[PDB]
């Protein structure tokens, strides 16, 4: 298939109260398709780092890979990790970019 | 090519808005969220993640996303039924909030 980039971002959480990422995921009768960055919030660690983008797929947190768990379980892990101190390592597939919110109609 | 295209005709007499948010890539435009009790919510067929291909006689496949959105707003503002043609996502998108 067409080449996709992956990046690993190490976040110093000392000066932040949040990653500042929303998470969206698709789950239906056909399976779970993984979890993605929905949007980013200025003021959080991920914005300050400046590499991750809406639409990127979150593959792994620290050494915990999500590709063989449910979206719900992946989110449980992310939840656990953000409530503990110290650096957070996020690895994303660069599936994102090019997204625009047009608002309500 | 599209898998599962549906035609959704909305009666816009009972409603003011479609009650959908739109996000575009580019790529094309997609349903971001659906607001309870709006035309689209009342209708029930369209789901978050579906791709919006056409409205009435205006096909978006040869149009920029910004132009598509402006066409759509113009049409919602004017009286008349609205026919949306969507390519289905399969549904099941979930918002998990913030971290
Ligand atoms: Cl990297």
Swiss-Prot record, chain A:
Compartments, as annotated in UniProt: Cell membrane; Cytoplasm, Cytosol; Cytoplasmic vesicle; Nucleus
Transmembrane spans: none
Region of interest (Required for interaction with FOXK2), ranges: 5-95
Mod. after translation: Phosphorylated by CSNK1D. WNT3A induces DVL2 phosphorylation by CSNK1E and MARK kinases. Ubiquitinated via 'Lys-63'-linked polyubiquitin chains; leading to its autophagy-mediated degradation.
Effect recorded for residue 8 to A: Almost abolishes interaction with FOXK2
The PDZ domain, residue ranges: 8-80
Outcome of swapping residue 10 to A: Almost abolishes interaction with FOXK2
Effect in UniProt of substituting residue 23 to T: Found in a renal cell carcinoma case; somatic mutation
Domain notes: The DIX domain mediates homooligomerization.
Oligomeric form and interacting partners: Interacts through its PDZ domain with the C-terminal regions of VANGL1 and VANGL2. Interacts with Rac. Interacts with ARRB1; the interaction is enhanced by phosphorylation of DVL1. Can form large oligomers (via DIX domain). Interacts (via DIX domain) with DIXDC1 (via DIX domain). Interacts (via DEP domain) with AP2M1 and the AP-2 complex. Interacts with DACT1 and FAM105B/otulin. Interacts with DCDC2. Interacts (when phosphorylated) with FOXK1 and FOXK2; the interaction induces DVL2 nuclear translocation. Interacts with MAPK15. Interacts with PKD1 (via extracellular domain).
Name recorded for this polypeptide: Segment polarity protein dishevelled homolog DVL-2
Organism expressing this protein natively: Homo sapiens (Human)
Full-length numbering of the shown residues: 264 to 354 of 736
